[PDB]
Design a protein around this ligand. Sequence first.
Ligand SMILES: Cn1nc(-c2cnc(N)c(-n3ccc(C(N)=O)n3)n2)nc1C1(c2ccccc2)CC1
Length: 830
Amino acid sequence: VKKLINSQISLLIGKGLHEFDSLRDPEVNDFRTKMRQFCEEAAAHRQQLGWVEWLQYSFPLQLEPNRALLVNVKFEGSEESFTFQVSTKDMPLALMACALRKKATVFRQQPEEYALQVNGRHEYLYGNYPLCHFQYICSCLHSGLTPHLTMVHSSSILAMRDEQSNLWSLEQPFSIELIEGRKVNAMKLVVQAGLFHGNEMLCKTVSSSEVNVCSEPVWKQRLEFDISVCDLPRMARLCFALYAVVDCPIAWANLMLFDYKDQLKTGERCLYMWPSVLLNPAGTVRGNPNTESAAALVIYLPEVAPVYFPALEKILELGRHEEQLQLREILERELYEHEKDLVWKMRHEVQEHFPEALARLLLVTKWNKHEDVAQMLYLLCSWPELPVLSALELLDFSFPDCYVGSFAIKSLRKLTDDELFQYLLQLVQVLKYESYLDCELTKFLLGRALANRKIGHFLFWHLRSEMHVPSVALRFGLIMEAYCRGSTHHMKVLMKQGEALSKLKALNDFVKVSSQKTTKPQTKEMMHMCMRQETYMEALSHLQSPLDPSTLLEEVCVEQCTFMDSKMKPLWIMYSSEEAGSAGNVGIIFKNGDDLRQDMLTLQMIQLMDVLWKQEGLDLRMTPYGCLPTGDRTGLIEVVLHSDTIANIQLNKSNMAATAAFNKDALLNWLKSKNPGEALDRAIEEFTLSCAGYCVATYVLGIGDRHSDNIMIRESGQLFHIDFGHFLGNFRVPFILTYDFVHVIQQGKTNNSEKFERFRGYCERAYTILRRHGLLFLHLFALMRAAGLPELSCSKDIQYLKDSLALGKTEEEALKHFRVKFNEALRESW
Ligand SMILES: Cn1nc(-c2cnc(N)c(-n3ccc(C(N)=O)n3)n2)nc1C1(c2ccccc2)CC1
């Protein structure tokens, strides 16, 4: 049983558990055991949870960020149902009470003993919330559809639970012995070495002597740093760069000066270097696992004798020891040395009256002076809990201190499961900045994953998608193993998704081959013939959607499956569910060959924009569809059904009802056929609302190469963008407006200023709302720099956001510049 589970984790994570053992690494073995226990403790707490608490784990509530409606209800072991006319203001309890009353009359004779399952979905309705606060109810109030729900008794949820169980004394300078190399280049070799605490140098970067190019260069040179051994901060990083000069970079490598047990390192170290794109402080402190092709830098850390980093009780003991200022008020809304001295002097007054300025003072503390650090740490240890927004900033590489990091985690505990889900992608990326395997962020990510099955799901996939990346393969694999130990049943549920994805990779490889060799109907027929095989039928059916674990992908609709003509021949896979009805008619797009990490970020940023607008009582009818990277240049996209491209509608194909005399009318003619009579006016308003949100979103995010093939419309009138290959103006893009879209907004009239001026106001509002949250976008995109995205490489990518959101300016200057940008787009629109 314990063996099968081990062989199951190895297959699921993609790395044999034997590989973790073969390292003989005390750091790896300590994490594995400690985390396993932590995760088994979390699995044990789950089985003693009440049946409602376990519903909150397995099926977290999908909520929205007077008017009656039909609702169809049935009980678990029966085909018999009942349709009620309930209210949107009614709680699930009133609905369940009605449902029990109808059962009593029919069966000829307690609501609190039940929960309402969404038919053929892992989504439930419970809690003291009116029906219109539920995402599903709204997914029915807008599509016009009738909600279908099932009464599930407490004992039936408890049957589910059960089946789902398992020092300051050393004032001498820091120096090293640079022994030799084992590399390749075309010229002389030089080694640059620097000591860092995050983004900043602790002292000036020291260089090596020029040694002539060869495969095994020798230096045996002592490199001395302008810093005392007693002044090395705990998270100090000794960074190396190997380059060939007459400059040409070759390789880089980093290492922490203290180990995971806080002991200062001695003596011989062999550094398996990483290929270069000069000094890279942000890069991994673990050497290249490719010890066969990797260049190796041999160094010696000289013995100073065992020296451990002083415990917090020693740091604290040390640390304890005019109206003109502020002054510091005016610089607290990127500063000179005199202003940094002001902040350091005022450090106590910052804790007292500006706790949120913690990040500004953390940047001014002299981390290369052990007494200056202790003083900061004494203040930090009494520092009030910071807001989530300020805490998100402290996760950055600019704040590498472990005590700062621990303080940031302590402040993100108050994060709701909804807020955590929204920023889960960025928190996972921050793991790349981590210096040790055992960290507060891993423990936080795991603890929250094991207490919420949806968080658990996405933590797994974010990590699993990066297993082909050698710099994060050990960390991510170890975290996923610890997770699986905390959820044996979820492990198998995820295995079912990997098996389905394995079949789609094999199926898509054939589609790629066949498309270059025969006609599309010939390829489609054999794709279908291959799908109908027992192993493909078994693997592609009855799984949880990796895009949303609450979507149940039941029976695969082979006849409705196809592939798109684009570069990578993406697979279009359709599913159906008898039990779910129309909610079970769901599609997935399997794309293989492109990097979907950016597309996901872009879709997540739009999803956030929609959330923020909804918070301010604005629903700009956005379509933030799923996009999940699953593997190496592999992922899934959610099919937005009953939609088509602008190019397909505008292609003006004959015989159809959408036939237009003029191109400008093609969109409005298509909407007239999909929404006839009284339904048209509703479609136009959906179009206008969705158009305004995407106008602002694409402008703020700087989305370029926008044509009729990457813009879509739902039959409801809602416009949305697809295929986000590029963002942040990276090929300063303007605001975009189209005459044919402006035509739909103006009701199909050449002149209709009342409709266009309403539209212009939507664009202004949406923009002004996002501007207030401009710092959230800044912090989240700054965190996303860790990912390794070519279009989010530096500060010049972060700058696009600053300018698109006009963050340095006031609202009146920003709204004027937006009015200038909107009119520039209108004049350009013919
Ligand atoms: C009817 N339909 N619906 C879609 C659609 C829906 N939802 C999406 N998310 C999406 N999509 C595509 C690529 C990306 C992306 N994010 O990269 N997103 N496409 N596409 C089609 C057409 C189609 C389908 C299948 C075969 C031929 C032709 C073109 C008509």
